[PDB]
Write a protein that binds this ligand. Structure first.
Ligand SMILES: [Mg+2]
Ligand SMILES: [Mg+2]
Ligand SMILES: [Mg+2]
Ligand SMILES: [Mg+2]
Ligand SMILES: [Mg+2]
Ligand SMILES: [Mg+2]
Ligand SMILES: [Mg+2]
Ligand SMILES: [Mg+2]
Ligand SMILES: [Mg+2]
Ligand SMILES: [Mg+2]
Ligand SMILES: [Mg+2]
Ligand SMILES: [Mg+2]
Ligand SMILES: [Mg+2]
Ligand SMILES: [Mg+2]
Ligand SMILES: [Mg+2]
Ligand SMILES: [Mg+2]
Ligand SMILES: [Mg+2]
Ligand SMILES: [Mg+2]
Ligand SMILES: [Mg+2]
Ligand SMILES: [Mg+2]
Ligand SMILES: [Mg+2]
Ligand SMILES: [Mg+2]
Ligand SMILES: [Mg+2]
Ligand SMILES: [Mg+2]
Ligand SMILES: [Mg+2]
Ligand SMILES: [Mg+2]
Ligand SMILES: [Mg+2]
Ligand SMILES: [Mg+2]
Ligand SMILES: [Mg+2]
Ligand SMILES: [Mg+2]
Ligand SMILES: [Mg+2]
Ligand SMILES: [Mg+2]
Ligand SMILES: [Mg+2]
Ligand SMILES: [Mg+2]
Ligand SMILES: [Mg+2]
Ligand SMILES: [Mg+2]
Ligand SMILES: [Mg+2]
Ligand SMILES: [Mg+2]
Ligand SMILES: [Mg+2]
Ligand SMILES: [Mg+2]
Ligand SMILES: [Mg+2]
Ligand SMILES: [Mg+2]
Ligand SMILES: [Mg+2]
Ligand SMILES: [Mg+2]
Ligand SMILES: [Mg+2]
Ligand SMILES: [Mg+2]
Ligand SMILES: [Mg+2]
Ligand SMILES: [Mg+2]
Ligand SMILES: [Mg+2]
Ligand SMILES: [Mg+2]
Ligand SMILES: [Mg+2]
Ligand SMILES: [Mg+2]
Ligand SMILES: [Mg+2]
Ligand SMILES: [Mg+2]
Ligand SMILES: [Mg+2]
Ligand SMILES: [Mg+2]
Ligand SMILES: [Mg+2]
Ligand SMILES: [Mg+2]
Ligand SMILES: [Mg+2]
Ligand SMILES: [Mg+2]
Ligand SMILES: [Mg+2]
Ligand SMILES: [Mg+2]
Ligand SMILES: [Mg+2]
Ligand SMILES: [Mg+2]
Ligand SMILES: [Mg+2]
Ligand SMILES: [Mg+2]
Ligand SMILES: [Mg+2]
Ligand SMILES: [Mg+2]
Ligand SMILES: [Mg+2]
Ligand SMILES: [Mg+2]
Ligand SMILES: [Mg+2]
Ligand SMILES: [Mg+2]
Ligand SMILES: [Mg+2]
Ligand SMILES: [Mg+2]
Ligand SMILES: [Mg+2]
Ligand SMILES: [Mg+2]
Ligand SMILES: [Mg+2]
Ligand SMILES: [Mg+2]
Ligand SMILES: [Mg+2]
Ligand SMILES: [Mg+2]
Ligand SMILES: [Mg+2]
Ligand SMILES: [Mg+2]
Ligand SMILES: [Mg+2]
Ligand SMILES: [Mg+2]
Ligand SMILES: [Mg+2]
Ligand SMILES: [Mg+2]
Ligand SMILES: [Mg+2]
Ligand SMILES: [Mg+2]
Ligand SMILES: [Mg+2]
Ligand SMILES: [Mg+2]
Ligand SMILES: [Mg+2]
Ligand SMILES: [Mg+2]
Lengths: 114, 275, 68, 100, 88
RNA sequence: UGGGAGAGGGUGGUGGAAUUCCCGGAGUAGCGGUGAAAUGCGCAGAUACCGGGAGGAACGCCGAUGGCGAAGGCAGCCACCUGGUCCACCCGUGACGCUGAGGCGCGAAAGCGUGGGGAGCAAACCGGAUUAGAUACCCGGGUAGUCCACGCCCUAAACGAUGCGCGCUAGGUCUCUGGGUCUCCUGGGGGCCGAAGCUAACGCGUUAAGCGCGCCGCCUGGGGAGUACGGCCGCAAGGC
């Protein structure tokens, strides 16, 4: 059981993945557009992220989790709604930080990003 | 820089020779040579046990110092750089301030006149030898011992080197010339720098004769033989392999791994070679 | 609210003056545009250059997480 | 001769003896490459903006020196060899550029 | 680079009269100085093509002067290229 | 002589973010992908998360309608070596100039040779889609190559589709970078709008496509054709 921990929001154009960890960063539970039952592009919808964030929060609280720090990565549509759903879940959201990876001009991207 | 020839014979067209530019002395130290007893690839029963060997130029063996930890703290001046017919590297004559003289394999960049020394306190400079544990992670090295005091076994061929990758307790992690990743005990000595004569691999023998000078006798294909001789022997006209390609002794020769499975050193080998 | 105003005399070339230089960095660690630093073209060019040195010494970040 | 500023971050978790030894290797080095120290400023520990050698702090040395041009890249190389030296940065000294 | 002192020494050595700067011999000598220094540079940096353009320009410049000097006074020309060891 | 700006060039070092892979931990039922899908990956434990490591390539913000270079082109930061260029002083030389057939050098990418290197990307190739079909577009893979050294190749919408130099012919406005006495003035760049003039028009207009002089290159209806033949160059591709 862990009272406080972290909530990671991996939000892309195709899906939203939410994984709740412990304070060290080790996963307790996770959920996504797939887990709450969507397939295909539907997983990238804001509502999908909402159900996902909830199901992840619900599962987490079942381990005693009360407070979380929210770490957000990605520019997906389901982003804000996931953040929303975490707040409106019953968890304390002690903080909110975006840690989205951005290169300082590293590897050549695939064709579609050029 | 390998030396080319004009095509004034069919063979000189392709033949290349080493330029021998690093070489400053063309005679070996008399007290550091002994006769190399030629075997022809025959063992003590008189049997060929390695095929196609013999008939190469006469050679004297140069005694090489593969220990170094032998004379810790005693600096030596690099007196000369010489040819060694028994190895691909060049060799460097050391004059210890001791008055003792020895050979080491010549590192890349070694200069006659310069000074080298061995020991835990040696400066990190080309030609010096230290236990691995005192050599900075990342520095490229050669003439590495495998076990402490047993002598340099690793990275001795022309142009080769190992790189220190990291440390783990009593051991240090090397990338061997083969790309194999391996723990080697920290007390093992190594010499900083890479082995010299890096252009060795660009030499083109050019003609059958040159292989003979080296003691390599003609290799004959299994496919050129008869079934008494070889798995590939026989067949009317030319023949494909007609079975998995095999050695003269019948074991498979395309891919079949042959290192012993339950070997104790497996505990020390982190990652098998590349490529 | 231009950063150059909030300071008096400072050295555009002093890569060790973390306290002054950290003003010219956004809350995300990035180098601020001229429209926030009030610097001319010539002075911004010196600022950027000495900021990068300070980062290499370890005195300024290359990047920072964005807290909301 | 030109004037340079030798910047050095050392292992922040040495004792004052090892620290003193490092400073000694450095000083002999400075002299060996013909560098004449003019000013010198030892700021010691400092919170780093990011970890270096996986450590939040670094121990800062700083020497304004005067030395021959050709030897400075070599000097820097010699300075970096020791494990406890985690950064070296040798800069040409410049007149300050003032704002305001 | 090439220092203020060294330049002075060359100038005073080829100056036609006490204050003389910018005369042909001084110009040729200053160019001859830069040329030879660059030549050495390019021997090590064979791949610095952009600076080599600089060399061609200097060589071109010196060439024109020496034609001029040799046009005017063959005597000072022969003595100048000899004092510098230039023809070839 | 005294200064200035700059991704100008070369060499040696060195920093951080990110991708991939490998190791350890934690965790479970999907992940990825698209217009929607499927191939693919995943209970042999993927994705998402944390720590460790390896390695190659490119340098976020600054960054701009910006700067530099003859052109190609040049962008983390440090040092060394080195080119061009501008200004102020008006000190020296005394037409020493302009151009420039040949020649020589440089010359993006792709390509070639020998050797290294190979993370990402990606011709060819394999597969999934799409579609009437789809040797494509999209998706999942994937080898040369992309990177380094040396040697070749010598092309291009190599463009401002605008040769170089000089003199002359309203100004307005933004900008880069010097020197003033710092209002502003004056140099050198980079844009925009426009006097006169030019132009078939579009447009150009002190960065001329205006008015003049010098020298070079080039055109002479479309296709055939940058082909053939000859010659010269190249390892070849193929170039002139
Ligand atoms: Mg999706
Ligand atoms: Mg050689
Ligand atoms: Mg030859
Ligand atoms: Mg030959
Ligand atoms: Mg010959
Ligand atoms: Mg013949
Ligand atoms: Mg032949
Ligand atoms: Mg020879
Ligand atoms: Mg040799
Ligand atoms: Mg002999
Ligand atoms: Mg004897
Ligand atoms: Mg005897
Ligand atoms: Mg023997
Ligand atoms: Mg024997
Ligand atoms: Mg016997
Ligand atoms: Mg017997
Ligand atoms: Mg017998
Ligand atoms: Mg045999
Ligand atoms: Mg034999
Ligand atoms: Mg030899
Ligand atoms: Mg050889
Ligand atoms: Mg060979
Ligand atoms: Mg032999
Ligand atoms: Mg053979
Ligand atoms: Mg054979
Ligand atoms: Mg037969
Ligand atoms: Mg028999
Ligand atoms: Mg039998
Ligand atoms: Mg048989
Ligand atoms: Mg057979
Ligand atoms: Mg048969
Ligand atoms: Mg047969
Ligand atoms: Mg047959
Ligand atoms: Mg037969
Ligand atoms: Mg046969
Ligand atoms: Mg046959
Ligand atoms: Mg066969
Ligand atoms: Mg057969
Ligand atoms: Mg068969
Ligand atoms: Mg066997
Ligand atoms: Mg062993
Ligand atoms: Mg170090
Ligand atoms: Mg300063
Ligand atoms: Mg010039
Ligand atoms: Mg002449
Ligand atoms: Mg000057
Ligand atoms: Mg794992
Ligand atoms: Mg990780
Ligand atoms: Mg930009
Ligand atoms: Mg521009
Ligand atoms: Mg320009
Ligand atoms: Mg005058
Ligand atoms: Mg006069
Ligand atoms: Mg021509
Ligand atoms: Mg080219
Ligand atoms: Mg290329
Ligand atoms: Mg290529
Ligand atoms: Mg090829
Ligand atoms: Mg190649
Ligand atoms: Mg070939
Ligand atoms: Mg290759
Ligand atoms: Mg690969
Ligand atoms: Mg296909
Ligand atoms: Mg189909
Ligand atoms: Mg069909
Ligand atoms: Mg397809
Ligand atoms: Mg593809
Ligand atoms: Mg791919
Ligand atoms: Mg191919
Ligand atoms: Mg190939
Ligand atoms: Mg090919
Ligand atoms: Mg090349
Ligand atoms: Mg041409
Ligand atoms: Mg353009
Ligand atoms: Mg132009
Ligand atoms: Mg054209
Ligand atoms: Mg022309
Ligand atoms: Mg001014
Ligand atoms: Mg101005
Ligand atoms: Mg203007
Ligand atoms: Mg206009
Ligand atoms: Mg009009
Ligand atoms: Mg006209
Ligand atoms: Mg006018
Ligand atoms: Mg105007
Ligand atoms: Mg202009
Ligand atoms: Mg016109
Ligand atoms: Mg025609
Ligand atoms: Mg043709
Ligand atoms: Mg063509
Ligand atoms: Mg032909
Ligand atoms: Mg043409």
């Amino acid at each position: 059981q862990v009272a406080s921990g972290r909530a990671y929001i991996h939000a892309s154009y195709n899906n939203t993945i939410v994984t709740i960890t412990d304070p060290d960063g080790n996963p307790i539970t996770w959920s996504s557009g797939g887990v709450i039952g969507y397939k295909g592009s539907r997983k990238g919808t804001p509502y999908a992220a909402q159900l996902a964030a909830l199901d992840a929060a619900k599962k987490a609280m079942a381990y005693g989790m009360q407070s979380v720090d929210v770490i957000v990565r990605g520019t997906g549509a389901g982003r804000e709604q996931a953040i929303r759903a975490l707040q409106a879940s019953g968890l304390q959201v002690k903080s909110i930080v975006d840690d989205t990876p951005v290169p300082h001009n590293g590897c050549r991207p695939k064709k579609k990003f050029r | 820089a390998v030396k080319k020839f004009k095509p004034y014979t069919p063979s000189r067209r392709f033949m290349t020779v080493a330029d021998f530019s690093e070489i400053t002395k063309t005679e070996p130290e008399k007290s550091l040579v002994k006769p190399l007893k030629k075997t022809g690839g025959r063992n003590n029963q008189g049997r060929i046990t390695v095929r196609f060997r013999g008939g190469g130029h006469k050679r004297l063996y140069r005694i090489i110092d593969f220990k170094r930890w032998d004379k810790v703290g005693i600096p030596a001046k690099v007196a000369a750089i010489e040819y060694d017919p028994n190895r691909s590297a060049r060799i460097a004559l050391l004059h210890y301030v001791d008055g003792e003289k020895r050979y080491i394999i010549a590192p890349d960049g070694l200069q006659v006149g310069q000074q080298v020394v061995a020991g835990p306190d040696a400066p990190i400079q080309v030609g010096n030898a230290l236990p691995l544990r005192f050599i900075p992670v990342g520095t490229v090295v050669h003439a590495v011992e495998l076990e402490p005091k047993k002598g340099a076994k690793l990275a001795r061929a022309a142009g080769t080197s190992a790189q220190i990758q990291g440390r783990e307790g009593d051991y240090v992690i090397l990338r061997l010339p083969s790309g194999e990743l391996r723990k080697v005990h920290g007390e093992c000595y190594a010499t900083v720098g890479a082995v010299g004569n890096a252009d060795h691999k660009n030499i083109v023998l050019g003609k059958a004769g040159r292989s003979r000078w080296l003691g390599r006798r003609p290799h004959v294909r299994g496919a050129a033989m008869n079934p008494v001789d070889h798995p590939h022997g026989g067949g009317e006209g030319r023949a494909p392999r007609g079975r998995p390609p095999a050695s003269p002794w019948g074991w498979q020769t395309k891919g079949l791994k042959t290192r012993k499975r339950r070997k104790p050193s497996s505990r020390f080998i982190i990652a098998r070679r590349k490529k | 609210a231009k950063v150059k105003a909030t300071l008096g005399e400072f050295d555009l070339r002093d890569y060790r003056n973390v306290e002054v230089l950290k003003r010219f960095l956004s809350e995300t660690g990035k180098i601020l545009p001229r429209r926030r630093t009030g610097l001319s073209a010539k002075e911004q060019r010196i600022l950027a250059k000495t900021i990068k040195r300070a980062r290499i010494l370890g005195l300024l970040p290359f990047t920072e997480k964005l807290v909301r | 001769m030109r004037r340079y500023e030798v910047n050095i971050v050392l292992n922040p978790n040495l004792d004052q003896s090892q620290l003193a030894l490092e400073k000694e290797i450095i000083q002999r080095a400075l002299e060996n490459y013909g560098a004449r120290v003019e000013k010198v400023e030892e700021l010691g520990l400092r919170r780093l903006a990011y970890p270096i050698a996986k450590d939040p702090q670094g121990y800062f040395l700083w020497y304004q020196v005067e030395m021959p041009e050709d030897r400075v890249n070599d000097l820097a190389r010699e300075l970096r060899i020791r494990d406890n030296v985690r950064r070296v940065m040798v800069v040409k000294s410049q007149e300050p550029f003032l704002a305001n | 680079p090439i220092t203020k002192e060294e330049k002075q020494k060359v100038i005073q050595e080829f100056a036609r009269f006490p204050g003389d700067t910018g005369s042909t011999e001084v110009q040729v000598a200053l160019l001859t100085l830069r040329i030879n220094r660059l030549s050495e540079h390019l021997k090590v940096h064979k791949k610095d093509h952009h600076s080599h353009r600089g060399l061609l320009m200097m060589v071109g410049q010196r060439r024109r002067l020496l034609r001029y000097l040799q046009r005017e006074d063959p005597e000072r020309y022969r003595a100048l290229i000899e004092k510098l060891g230039i023809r070839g």
